[PDB]
Amino acid sequence: SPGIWQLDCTHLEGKVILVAVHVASGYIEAEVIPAETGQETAYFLLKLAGRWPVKTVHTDNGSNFTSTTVKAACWWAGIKQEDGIPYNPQSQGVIESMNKELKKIIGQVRDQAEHLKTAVQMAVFIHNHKRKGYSAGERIVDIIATDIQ
Amino acid sequence: SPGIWQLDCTHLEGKVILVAVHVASGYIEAEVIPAETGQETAYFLLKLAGRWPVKTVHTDNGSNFTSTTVKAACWWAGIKQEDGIPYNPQSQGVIESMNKELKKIIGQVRDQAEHLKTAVQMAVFIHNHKRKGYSAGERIVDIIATDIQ
Ligand SMILES: C=CCN(Cc1ccccc1C(=O)NCC1CCC1)Cc1ccc2c(c1C(=O)O)OC[C@H](CCC(=O)O)O2
Ligand SMILES: C=CCN(Cc1ccccc1C(=O)NCC1CCC1)Cc1ccc2c(c1C(=O)O)OC[C@H](CCC(=O)O)O2
Ligand SMILES: [Cl-]
Ligand SMILES: [Cl-]
């Protein structure tokens, strides 16, 4: 569980927001891209895995699961690439709610930036710092530190 | 010191590599940009502070210290923006050595990607995972978790 992440792709303003969620904590990273491609996904995972100890990624769709570019990045970064089938139905709901939450935050900050990417990074900040009490940022660090010890 | 970061800018292939170093751990994040501008620096800090609890940033030069765009991002993200004067001369040496190390790693991976940005992210990965025995990635998480507790 310390090492398990889930990919998630959502759309706004004719652009794609690619999100990785640390399952156990709810901590996220995100970026705006013109379109989801294998190359964009591969690069995003390479970034993520240099920053956090990513053991397993549940891909967001079959195209990213299939993509040899994505598989190559997962190989490079030592990530187990897995499907994203919601064997637990709770997971669909969790991601749906998360996408709705993020879009709400982006709306709340949208006038504070010209570019969507800026607003998305503001939303990442607010999401990760929000106390639910601990924040997602606190939880991911505690979970991983506990694992290291 | 859990919240103290240092900016560092280095050049390769006619491009700029912007680096943030977590001082106590040596953990890094980095990006390739066409040129250092206040806007590029501001966006980079916004990303960083959404991902780690950034309390203080020692800016890499006087232009980024002065920049009202950089100050705006530091205001937004709750970061204390400070100068980067090496009152401790060991700071110069540490950064210079870090730049040399990163460039060495980039060279070792350079043929594994067409684009410099990919090679830089590979270098970030290798640097953060390298055991020196703990890695910088382990050190940052331990330092921050101890602080939360
Ligand atoms: C078909 C993929 C292209 N490329 C093939 C390649 C080209 C030359 C040498 C080796 C390899 C190779 O297969 N290397 C092993 C893989 C394992 C991790 C690298 C690798 C790559 C992937 C994603 C990227 C890249 C790059 C790049 O070549 O730099 O560049 C930035 C781009 C940014 C996101 C965006 O713009 O979509 O994401
Ligand atoms: C002079 C800065 C331009 N901008 C002014 C602005 C424009 C409209 C509304 C508010 C504000 C405003 O001052 N907001 C408060 C600040 C506090 C954090 C945002 C803000 C900004 C900064 C860096 C960026 C941006 C953007 C943007 O407007 O989206 O866009 C992506 C760009 C990517 C890096 C690159 O390409 O250089 O980094
Ligand atoms: Cl945080
Ligand atoms: Cl790591």
From TrEMBL, chains A, B:
Q: Does the keyword section mention Iron-sulfur?
A: no
Q: Where are the transmembrane segments?
A: none
Q: Which reaction does it catalyse?
A: 3'-end directed exonucleolytic cleavage of viral RNA-DNA hybrid; Endohydrolysis of RNA in RNA/DNA hybrids. Three different cleavage modes: 1. sequence-specific internal cleavage of RNA. Human immunodeficiency virus type 1 and Moloney murine leukemia virus enzymes prefer to cleave the RNA strand one nucleotide away from the RNA-DNA junction. 2. RNA 5'-end directed cleavage 13-19 nucleotides from the RNA end. 3. DNA 3'-end directed cleavage 15-20 nucleotides away from the primer terminus
**Part of the full-length chain shown:** 57 to 209 of 288
The protein depicted here goes by the name Gag-Pol polyprotein
Q: Does the keyword Zinc-finger apply?
A: yes
Which UniProt keywords are present, listed alphabetically? Aspartyl protease, Capsid protein, DNA integration, DNA recombination, DNA-binding, DNA-directed DNA polymerase, Endonuclease, Eukaryotic host gene expression shutoff by virus, Eukaryotic host translation shutoff by virus, Host cell membrane, Host cytoplasm, Host gene expression shutoff by virus, Host membrane, Host nucleus, Host-virus interaction, Hydrolase, Lipid-binding, Lipoprotein, Magnesium, Membrane, Metal-binding, Multifunctional enzyme, Myristate, Nuclease, Nucleotidyltransferase, Phosphoprotein, Protease, Repeat, RNA-binding, RNA-directed DNA polymerase, Transferase, Viral genome integration, Viral nucleoprotein, Viral penetration into host nucleus, Viral release from host cell, Virion, Virion maturation, Virus entry into host cell, Zinc, Zinc-finger
One molecular function GO term is: RNA-directed DNA polymerase activity
Q: How does it sit in the membrane?
A: Lipid-anchor
The organism encoding this protein is Human immunodeficiency virus type 1 (HIV-1)
Cofactors per UniProt?
Mg(2+)
Which GO BP annotation is one of this protein's? symbiont-mediated suppression of host gene expression
Superkingdom classification of source = Viruses
Taxonomic classification: Viruses, Riboviria, Pararnavirae, Artverviricota, Revtraviricetes
**Where does the record place the Integrase catalytic domain?**
1-144
Name the GO cellular-component terms. host cell; host cell cytoplasm; host cell nucleus; host cell plasma membrane; viral nucleocapsid
Localization recorded for this chain is: Host cell membrane; Host cytoplasm; Host nucleus; Virion
